[PDB]
Amino acid sequence: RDAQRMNILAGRIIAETVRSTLGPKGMDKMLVDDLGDVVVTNDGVTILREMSVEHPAAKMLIEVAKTQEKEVGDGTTTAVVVAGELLRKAEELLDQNVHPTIVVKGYQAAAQKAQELLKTIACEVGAQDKEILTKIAMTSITGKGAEKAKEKLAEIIVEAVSAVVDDEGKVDKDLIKIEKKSGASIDDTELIKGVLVDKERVSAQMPKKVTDAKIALLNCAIEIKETETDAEIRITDPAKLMEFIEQEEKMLKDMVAEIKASGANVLFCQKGIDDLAQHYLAKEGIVAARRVKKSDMEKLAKATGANVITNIKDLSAQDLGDAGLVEERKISGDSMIFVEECKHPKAVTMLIRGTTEHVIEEVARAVDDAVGVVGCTIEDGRIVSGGGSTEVELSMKLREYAEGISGREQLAVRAFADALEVIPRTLAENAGLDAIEILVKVRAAHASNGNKCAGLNVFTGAVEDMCENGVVEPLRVKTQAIQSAAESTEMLLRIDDVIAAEKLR
């Protein structure tokens, strides 16, 4: 009859299914299709990418989740859960024959007020505090499962982001490369200022350590060259077969000789190298190598100011780079070259070691997500208490602000505050504790002059300080969550007419 009555209860099917999969714990409810492609993965946004939709109302809430994921990378599921909880409470007031106009404005007023309340609560942090940067790092890796040396990994990751601090105060993830190389264990983890490579020197006669070496890049290969124009070899006299072998002796002499005249102590190459070319580099004594990714040939020139040289004949001194200290040694595994550059570090890297290929890949994913959490703090410089210790504080202040709004509509803004208690309730139910007798203790810590960092810890299972245990989350995730949640609910309250048309392009 009314239709709308049946669409409100439809939204209570997606939020509940993606409610337990939030936080450390969370059982997976896989609804595989008839094909049988089971993909057990405790994830939320992934469930929305492969699932048949029943009503068009459930499709609009997916757009706001994708735009927020690429910009943040985490916390998008915290909005759809709290969103659905708001519609369930609105039914208590809908029965009173309330008009949607006065209801939709009640949430916008409380949401707009929360934008100013979340600022004073956010604590300021500098780009050199070695006490807050270390806590936010260890909190993210704890959930990965690596009790071998998580304390050391938190001290090295903070030393890198704290050293590549540009003048404007931003941070680029491209300036931190990753290297997956097996070793003895994680204890051998160390961050080198530069770039490593397992390509050992082809000849042992080459120098083992050279200080202030001129880097030289060659985009072409060191083999038989060929003119850009069309050309084909033609043989008719069998006596000329020996001249071709002798002709290469001259081309591979004056060409390679120019490298030494330019003052190039180190050389690099991508493709293979001619067999006879190994003799020229033996008498001169210059470092060389082969097989190098094209992407690596760009960071070296960008990190030192060098320029690629496609023709050795057109080589110059300005195009040469400047290596800090090159040397080949071993560090619990296969020997590798260390092309360091501490005189002016423009792009560092990171090396991780493990016992097996399956172990390094696990921690390899944590270093990427860790930079995202700390990467946004250095840019904004504002953080808030974690563990859901932000909504319970605002809910008590909105009651005072709701008193100023006279008339028979103050109950609307008040009902929105009571619905924000779902965050501390989900984490409490997953821990196996009652969420009715514990909600009173969290209020004592925020009564009058209580601390502004109290929260419930899932591990210990009792109210503690988020700053002491190390629980903390960015501020941008909270602004976008309240901002998106404030606009997401509008998609349901504003609409008031079923669309039963035909032919819509």
Give, in order, the Cα–Cα distances in Å from 460 to each of 20, 130, 443, 470, 496.
20, 25, 19, 13, 47
Strand partners, 286: none
Greatest Cα pair distance in the chain: 109
Q: Residue 247: in which H helix or E strand, if any?
A: helix 241-262
- Cα angle 151, 370, 333 (rounded to 5 degrees) comes to 60
Say if residues 73 and 3 touch (Cβ distance below 8 Å). no
CA 440/CA 458 separation, integer angstroms: 17
Whole-Å CA distances, 59 to 49, 352, 488? 11, 42, 12
Give the closest residue to 202 by CA, choosing from 216, 184, 222.
222
Residue 11 gets which letter from DSSP?
A: G
The first and second tokens of residue 212, run together, are 């202030």
Distance linking the first and last C-alpha atoms of the chain:
28
DSSP state of 115: H
1 CB neighbour count, 10 Å cutoff = 5
Pull the structure tokens for residue 11.
């939204």
CA distance 38 to 132: 41
Residues 6+ apart with CB under 8 A from 110: 398, 401, 402, 413, 416, 417
Amino acid (1-letter code) at residue 8: I
265 contacts 286 by C-beta, under 8 angstroms:
yes
What CA–CA distance (Å, rounded) separates 28 from 152? 32
Catalytic (active-site) positions? 43, 76-77, 369
Give the CA-trace dihedral at 139, 140, 144, 146, to 10 degrees: -50
CA distances from 174 to 159, 161, 303, 353, 428 (A): 17, 12, 12, 21, 39
Residue 44 to residue 220: CA distance in whole angstroms: 48
Q: For residue 421, how many other CB atoms are within 10 A of its CB?
A: 17
Residue 180, beta-bridge partner list:
352
Burial of 65 (C-beta count, 10 Å sphere; 0-12/13-18/19+): middle
What dihedral angle (degrees, nearest 10) is formed by the CA atoms of 188, 128, 475, 116? 170
Distance separating alpha carbons of residues 186 and 363, to the nearest angstrom:
10
Residues 191 and 348 sit within 8 Å (Cβ to Cβ)? yes
- Name the helix (H) or strand (E) containing 25: none
The DSSP secondary-structure symbol of 314 reads: G
DSSP structural state of residue 388? T
Asked if residues 466 and 387 have their Cβ atoms less than 8 Å apart, the reply is yes
Instruction: Give the resolution in Å.
Output: 6.3
Rounded distance between C-alpha atoms, residue 130 and residue 114, angstroms: 30
Q: Say how far apart CA 242 and CA 250 lie, in whole Å.
A: 14
Q: Six-digit token pair at 229?
A: 């124009």
Q: How far is CA 338 from CA 295, 326, 329, 342, in A?
A: 18, 6, 8, 12
- The 3-state DSSP class for residue 338 equals strand
Please name the amino acid found at residue 463.
V
Q: Tokens 């790092």 map to which residue?
A: 137
Measure CA 402 to chain center: 39
Method used to determine the 3D structure: cryo-EM
List 196's β-bridge partners, or say none: 338
Residue 263 DSSP class: T
Helix (H) or strand (E) holding 100: helix 100-121
User: Across the strands, what pairs with 260?
Assistant: none
Q: Which of these, 279, 140, 141, 133, lies nearest to 203 by C-alpha position? A: 279
What DSSP string describes 141-205? Answer: HGGG---SSHHHHHHHHHHHHTTS--TTS---GGGB--EE---S-GGG-B--SEEEE----S-TT
Both tokens assigned to 453: 């960092």
Structure tokens at 279: 């003799």
Could you tell me which of 436, 328, 442 has the C-alpha nearest to residue 396? 442
Comparing CA positions, the residue from 240, 225, 224, 227 lying closest to residue 275 is 224
* Secondary structure letter of residue 214 according to DSSP: -
Measured in degrees and rounded to the nearest 5, phi and psi for residue 252 equal -85, 5
CA dist., res. 420 & res. 81, Å (int): 10
DSSP secondary structure string, 429-485?
Answer: HHTT--SSSSTTHHHHTTSSS--S-EEE-TTT-SEEEHHHHT-EEESHHHHHHHHHH
Angle at alpha carbon of residue 398, lines to 458 and 122, rounded to 5°: 55
**Euclidean distance between CA atoms 212 and 58, whole angstroms:** 62
Tokens of 172: 């680029």
